[PDB]
Scaffold this motif. Structure first.
Motif, PDB file in Angstrom:
ATOM      1  N   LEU A   1      -8.910   1.754 -11.373  1.00 51.52           N
ATOM      2  CA  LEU A   1      -7.582   1.433 -10.875  1.00 51.52           C
ATOM      3  C   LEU A   1      -7.687   0.404  -9.751  1.00 51.52           C
ATOM      4  O   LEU A   1      -8.063   0.736  -8.626  1.00 51.52           O
ATOM      5  CB  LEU A   1      -6.883   2.700 -10.369  1.00 51.52           C
ATOM      6  CG  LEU A   1      -5.794   2.484  -9.305  1.00 51.52           C
ATOM      7  CD1 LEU A   1      -4.772   1.445  -9.749  1.00 51.52           C
ATOM      8  CD2 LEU A   1      -5.107   3.802  -8.980  1.00 51.52           C
ATOM      9  N   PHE A   2      -7.368  -0.847 -10.060  1.00 51.99           N
ATOM     10  CA  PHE A   2      -7.424  -1.910  -9.066  1.00 51.99           C
ATOM     11  C   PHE A   2      -6.039  -2.166  -8.478  1.00 51.99           C
ATOM     12  O   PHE A   2      -5.088  -2.434  -9.210  1.00 51.99           O
ATOM     13  CB  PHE A   2      -7.982  -3.192  -9.685  1.00 51.99           C
ATOM     14  CG  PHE A   2      -8.654  -4.095  -8.692  1.00 51.99           C
ATOM     15  CD1 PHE A   2      -7.905  -4.862  -7.814  1.00 51.99           C
ATOM     16  CD2 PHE A   2     -10.037  -4.172  -8.633  1.00 51.99           C
ATOM     17  CE1 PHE A   2      -8.523  -5.691  -6.898  1.00 51.99           C
ATOM     18  CE2 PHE A   2     -10.659  -4.999  -7.718  1.00 51.99           C
ATOM     19  CZ  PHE A   2      -9.902  -5.760  -6.849  1.00 51.99           C
ATOM     20  N   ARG A   3      -5.935  -2.082  -7.155  1.00 50.24           N
ATOM     21  CA  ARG A   3      -4.657  -2.296  -6.478  1.00 50.24           C
ATOM     22  C   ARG A   3      -4.641  -3.641  -5.754  1.00 50.24           C
ATOM     23  O   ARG A   3      -4.896  -3.713  -4.553  1.00 50.24           O
ATOM     24  CB  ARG A   3      -4.375  -1.160  -5.489  1.00 50.24           C
ATOM     25  CG  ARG A   3      -5.150   0.115  -5.778  1.00 50.24           C
ATOM     26  CD  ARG A   3      -4.830   1.208  -4.767  1.00 50.24           C
ATOM     27  NE  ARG A   3      -4.931   0.736  -3.390  1.00 50.24           N
ATOM     28  CZ  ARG A   3      -4.807   1.532  -2.330  1.00 50.24           C
ATOM     29  NH1 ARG A   3      -4.589   2.830  -2.493  1.00 50.24           N
ATOM     30  NH2 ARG A   3      -4.898   1.028  -1.107  1.00 50.24           N
ATOM     31  N   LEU A   4      -4.342  -4.698  -6.514  1.00 46.14           N
ATOM     32  CA  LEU A   4      -4.284  -6.075  -6.003  1.00 46.14           C
ATOM     33  C   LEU A   4      -3.993  -6.147  -4.504  1.00 46.14           C
ATOM     34  O   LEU A   4      -4.794  -6.691  -3.741  1.00 46.14           O
ATOM     35  CB  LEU A   4      -3.220  -6.858  -6.780  1.00 46.14           C
ATOM     36  CG  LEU A   4      -2.575  -8.029  -6.030  1.00 46.14           C
ATOM     37  CD1 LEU A   4      -3.587  -9.136  -5.781  1.00 46.14           C
ATOM     38  CD2 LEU A   4      -1.380  -8.561  -6.807  1.00 46.14           C
ATOM     39  N   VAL A   5      -2.845  -5.611  -4.097  1.00 46.50           N
ATOM     40  CA  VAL A   5      -2.432  -5.627  -2.693  1.00 46.50           C
ATOM     41  C   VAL A   5      -3.603  -5.396  -1.744  1.00 46.50           C
ATOM     42  O   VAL A   5      -4.028  -6.308  -1.036  1.00 46.50           O
ATOM     43  CB  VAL A   5      -1.344  -4.574  -2.405  1.00 46.50           C
ATOM     44  CG1 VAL A   5       0.032  -5.217  -2.407  1.00 46.50           C
ATOM     45  CG2 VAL A   5      -1.411  -3.446  -3.422  1.00 46.50           C
ATOM     46  N   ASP A   6      -4.122  -4.175  -1.735  1.00 46.14           N
ATOM     47  CA  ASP A   6      -5.237  -3.830  -0.869  1.00 46.14           C
ATOM     48  C   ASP A   6      -6.569  -4.149  -1.540  1.00 46.14           C
ATOM     49  O   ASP A   6      -7.637  -3.899  -0.982  1.00 46.14           O
ATOM     50  CB  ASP A   6      -5.172  -2.349  -0.494  1.00 46.14           C
ATOM     51  CG  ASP A   6      -4.036  -2.043   0.462  1.00 46.14           C
ATOM     52  OD1 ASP A   6      -2.894  -1.864  -0.009  1.00 46.14           O
ATOM     53  OD2 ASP A   6      -4.288  -1.985   1.685  1.00 46.14           O
ATOM     54  N   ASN A   7      -6.487  -4.711  -2.744  1.00 45.67           N
ATOM     55  CA  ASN A   7      -7.670  -5.081  -3.513  1.00 45.67           C
ATOM     56  C   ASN A   7      -8.628  -3.903  -3.676  1.00 45.67           C
ATOM     57  O   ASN A   7      -9.844  -4.083  -3.691  1.00 45.67           O
ATOM     58  CB  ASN A   7      -8.392  -6.251  -2.846  1.00 45.67           C
ATOM     59  CG  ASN A   7      -7.492  -7.458  -2.664  1.00 45.67           C
ATOM     60  OD1 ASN A   7      -6.818  -7.597  -1.644  1.00 45.67           O
ATOM     61  ND2 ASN A   7      -7.478  -8.341  -3.657  1.00 45.67           N
ATOM     62  N   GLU A   8      -8.073  -2.702  -3.801  1.00 51.08           N
ATOM     63  CA  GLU A   8      -8.889  -1.503  -3.967  1.00 51.08           C
ATOM     64  C   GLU A   8      -9.328  -1.347  -5.414  1.00 51.08           C
ATOM     65  O   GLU A   8      -8.766  -1.973  -6.313  1.00 51.08           O
ATOM     66  CB  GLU A   8      -8.116  -0.262  -3.531  1.00 51.08           C
ATOM     67  CG  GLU A   8      -7.589  -0.347  -2.114  1.00 51.08           C
ATOM     68  CD  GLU A   8      -8.697  -0.414  -1.081  1.00 51.08           C
ATOM     69  OE1 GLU A   8      -9.168   0.658  -0.645  1.00 51.08           O
ATOM     70  OE2 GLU A   8      -9.094  -1.537  -0.707  1.00 51.08           O
TER      71      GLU A   8
END
Length: 116
Positions: A83-90
């Motif tokens: 699960l990649f969260r662009l925003v926080d780049n997680e």
């Protein structure tokens, strides 16, 4: 057998086919939150559970891949779901420790947990 209109009941929406690393990171870069199922086999409980979570998390970028290069780039070694969260780049790697006994609840959970 069918490629035209009227494919039959049962579809709604399915995860994107990220057969390439660039395409993967692209679909992830083209959205805030992105969930992808990096599977070496599309016959595991994780696949249905993901295709299911897809309708449970429309906002989330549904994705799925089986390419070696990709499963390698993400160090995928057990039908892992990232699960990649662009925003926080997680990047949450739901690996075997979570794929071996993955459940629609779990996937949807982990997501609901890091769907930032």
């Amino acid at each position: 057998e069918v490629e035209k209109s009227s494919d039959g009941p049962g579809a709604a929406q399915e995860p994107t086919w990220l057969t390439d690393v660039p395409a993967a990171m692209e679909f992830i870069a083209a959205t805030e939150v992105a969930v992808i199922g990096f599977f070496q086999d599309l016959e595991i409980p994780a696949v249905p559970i993901l295709h299911s979570m897809v309708q449970k998390f429309p906002g989330v970028s549904f994705g799925i891949s089986t390419d070696s290069e990709v499963l390698t780039h993400y160090n995928i070694t057990g039908n892992t779901i990232c699960l990649f969260r662009l925003v926080d780049n997680e990047q949450l790697n739901l690996e075997d420790e979570d794929i071996e006994s993955i459940d629609a609840t779990k996937l949807s959970r982990f997501i609901e947990i890091n769907s930032l």
